[PDB]
Design a protein around this ligand. Structure first.
Ligand SMILES: [K+]
Ligand SMILES: [K+]
Ligand SMILES: [K+]
Ligand SMILES: [K+]
Ligand SMILES: [Zn+2]
Ligand SMILES: [Zn+2]
Lengths: 161, 369, 161, 369
């Protein structure tokens, strides 16, 4: 419970740039844009597009439970992917819909919750009931072919049902 | 209306501190998902922050503290044990898989938004991943490994003479304080629980040193503070701060552990009272940087930052939570707002005013006209 | 087995119009166009749109059997309706997709085959096994609330299964 | 490439002649559905014909024949019985619900397409609903109530000096013949079964009368004719017809009952041989009007007209039938093409040439240079 003074504690204060000096920072190496807030589109069109994106989703998983697959296609991964699809296609509805159905075939987007097999989900529940919330051990012993980060993602989604 | 830039990387929610640990990064993903379905995502510029490299992490930290973090893994954990004690990584701040990447996203978000602010291409910038304020120059403290806030401020000192830092987190913002303890270009204002609490600093008499004396405001508090108590001490103080310190950029840390019913915290604040600070700060129309921080009842953390983003966009959201992947997390109620508890407020009016007056004096010590 | 001659058998031959005389026929009162063959669209885009139209169809009937509903939405009524939707929206993909999802809600198109109730289909099979292919009697006695033309349409579709 | 206009109204397939009756209008809907899924629909201008009113139906028919049809229903069937015998409606041509509307769609399609041809805004026009050729001026004959063909030709006589009518239907096209029996402006050429068959007319010696003498070609035939026999008699004759009669608009009736395995017909033609006529006629590059007609094994009728539309667009379609609402109708095979039967061809080369030469003579009687 003490605050310290010295060169090993305080930060070297960055000097204010002169009106002729430039910061020299590459913005691309810092960020990439995922959604522009100022679109030629209306809340209605975006809402409609998200319905279409969901529709394509259910139809996709119909091509190898009706409420089940619709709810599956309604999950945030599909929605987020739809928002990205819009942005990547410069907010052209016509163009963005073609991206959803590339060659007359739909696109599937499945989160770790939906993606795991019937046996993998069963392995998870055994690992949890035995090792508590020790996820490194849960993989090392029960699901060592899954990445740890996927097991985390799956866990939190499973916490719902 | 002010333009808002939001920073998020999909990976952040999947880094895990360890079994039994209170700090759960997933809370950021929860916020994110709510933001989409409340339709707020739609309304702000969304950016994916690129990883922050050792290069810019060392613009404040040690060349060999960052080098330790970049190298440390759960593999060589029994090999590094000497350096683990020197840097305080292993117990208070545990070693976990992905640790460094988690620091890169947290820092990258804060820096990219600071540049965004300096480049004058946004009015507000938001990074709920960042705001980790207990980190020191050569050690990890209180679940913070890299102080993203300091680096964010160092970038803002390039275009702004005076940078104000405000910290609502229940724990004293010592990292950001210590890092700027001897400068007059950055004022650090903090409101926290004091007395058998962490990090043991930030009492009334914590004022600064050298050029930085009278430039480190601190408001020590006891248990059970209300929205009403908090507001009636937050607005008067900050008004005086703006009046005296006259900043040109604000950095607000919106630590969510000052909320009622927190696992680690012991205040009695609702989302509404907590947001009133964000709103009040927003009203001064200064290039603003909203960061996260603590928060350990994650249902509420998600509620809090969801709401406080609506505040930045000044749009209205209903108390009905929109359906989302984690909808079932939110009790039997599925509501956005929490109400205060029966908890007793040990901050008597006489105590708050005693401190308030000492701080008004300390602020009068600054130059003005 | 005889061909007849006379004013009561031959047609009055319409005289050829003079180069200055006009036929005087209103084309609107004769026809309305349903599809233009010369579109700004490609076979690919139209094919994609028909997938989207089918997708919206399955999602619609998901909102109150997965293969069943997909096949249902794949039937010609939905396809024909989709082609009309394109034409009515001047072959603008963006505009035509909004027509499919008017207010964030999808559109259903159901032929008499899909449309009839479980009891109506049962009534039909009893009426057929009893009255053969006498469809006026099939309605008069078994399904008198249905129009005769709908019973015809339904019959031919039922002839498949 | 020639531009094609297709005429269809959704109702046509839902009109029903009666129990046990061979004429099933549904066959048009089957064709329609195949056209969509083969992707041909996509390639041609699609029109919905508006109903043809009593006004233009009487441009050939009796003011009181049409007035009878407009009035007759299964209700007043026992009231009209006197007029039913005069007009031949009730047995050969039965009374059914919707009868008049069925005539309006069939006629409307043909007329609208004739106008379309005169207006020079299409090269080919198609109406599979029309082509009903046994209808006379004051009576219904052989499942035909309104002769859509005559009315179609009367409209074409407004812009075209000479209109050629070709009729492939197995039954003799007597309606279109009789209606134009005394004019030189319209030539009617027919190829049919003769001898204990319907309608009992159109023998070798059927040549016409008055101005119409030498202007009504007829090719009487026996059972089991091949594609090969048919082609070798169809091309030589039609070439001579075009050479002599020099028409400026063609109207081809593509009666599908001349196909092999027909319920009512007794020829041995495949879709391919049957289409070779359409293709050959198409080659003369004249404003063409393709109409339907008979056809009573509906699987094949649908196959035939589907294919013959591809001929008008000169695009290639695979033998694999595309999936459609009636896909299951099409046997175990699900193919477009039929092959000929073991049926014996009773049309010996000596018989065909005997007739061919008599017709070449009759055609030489026309003016030329
Ligand atoms: K604080
Ligand atoms: K300071
Ligand atoms: K014929
Ligand atoms: K004639
Ligand atoms: Zn805290
Ligand atoms: Zn016939």
């Amino acid at each position: 419970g003490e605050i310290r003074v010295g060169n090993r504690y305080q930060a070297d204060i960055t000097d204010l740039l002169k009106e002729g000096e430039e910061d020299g920072r590459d913005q691309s190496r810092l960020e990439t844009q995922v959604w522009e807030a100022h679109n030629p589109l209306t809340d209605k069109q975006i809402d409609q597009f998200l319905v279409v994106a969901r529709s394509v989703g259910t139809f996709a998983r119909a091509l190898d439970s009706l409420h089940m697959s619709a709810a599956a296609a309604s999950r945030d991964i599909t929605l987020f992917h739809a928002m990205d699809t819009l942005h990547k296609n410069i907010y052209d509805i016509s163009k963005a819909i073609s991206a959803l159905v590339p060659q007359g075939g739909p696109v599937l987007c499945r989160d770790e919750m939906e993606e795991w097999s019937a046996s993998e989900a069963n392995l998870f529940e055994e690992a949890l009931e035995k090792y508590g919330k020790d996820f490194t051990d849960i993989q090392q012993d029960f699901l060592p072919w899954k990445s740890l980060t996927s097991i985390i993602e799956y866990y939190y989604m499973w916490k719902t049902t | 209306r002010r333009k808002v830039c939001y920073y998020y990387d999909g990976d952040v929610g999947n880094y895990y501190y360890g079994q039994g640990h209170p700090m759960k990064p997933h809370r950021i993903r929860m916020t994110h998902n709510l933001l989409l379905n409340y339709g707020l995502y739609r309304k702000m510029e969304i950016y994916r922050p690129h990883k922050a490299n050792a290069e810019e992490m060392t613009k404040y930290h040690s060349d060999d503290y960052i080098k330790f973090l970049r190298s440390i893994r759960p593999d060589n954990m029994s090999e590094y044990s000497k350096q683990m004690q020197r840097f305080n990584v292993g117990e208070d701040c545990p070693v976990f898989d992905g640790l460094f990447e988690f620091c890169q996203l947290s820092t990258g978000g804060s820096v990219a938004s600071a540049v965004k602010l300096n480049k004058q291409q946004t009015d507000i910038a938001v990074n709920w991943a960042g705001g980790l304020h207990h980190a020191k120059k050569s050690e990890a403290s209180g679940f913070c490994y890299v102080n993203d806030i300091v680096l964010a401020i160092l970038e803002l000192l390039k275009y702004h003479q005076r940078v104000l830092y405000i910290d609502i987190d229940i724990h004293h913002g010592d990292g950001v304080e210590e890092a700027f303890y001897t400068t007059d270009r950055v004022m650090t204002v903090s409101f926290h629980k004091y007395g058998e609490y962490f990090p043991g600093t930030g009492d009334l008499r914590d004022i600064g040193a050298g050029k930085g004396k009278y430039y480190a405001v601190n408001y020590p508090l006891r248990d059970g503070i209300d929205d009403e108590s908090y507001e009636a001490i937050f607005k008067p103080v900050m008004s005086k701060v703006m009046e005296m310190f006259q900043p040109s950029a604000v950095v607000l840390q919106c630590g969510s552990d000052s909320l009622s019913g927190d696992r680690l915290g012991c205040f009695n604040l609702t989302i509404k009272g907590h947001a009133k600070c964000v709103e009040f700060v927003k009203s001064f129309n200064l290039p603003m940087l909203m960061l996260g921080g603590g928060g350990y009842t994650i249902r509420n953390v998600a509620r809090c930052w969801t709401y406080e983003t609506a505040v930045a966009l000044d749009t209205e959201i209903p108390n009905e939570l929109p359906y989302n992947d984690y909808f079932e997390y939110f009790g039997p109620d599925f509501k956005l707002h929490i109400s205060p508890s029966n908890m007793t407020n040990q901050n008597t009016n006489e105590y708050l005013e005693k401190i308030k007056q000492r701080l008004f004096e300390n602020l009068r010590m600054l130059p003005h006209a």
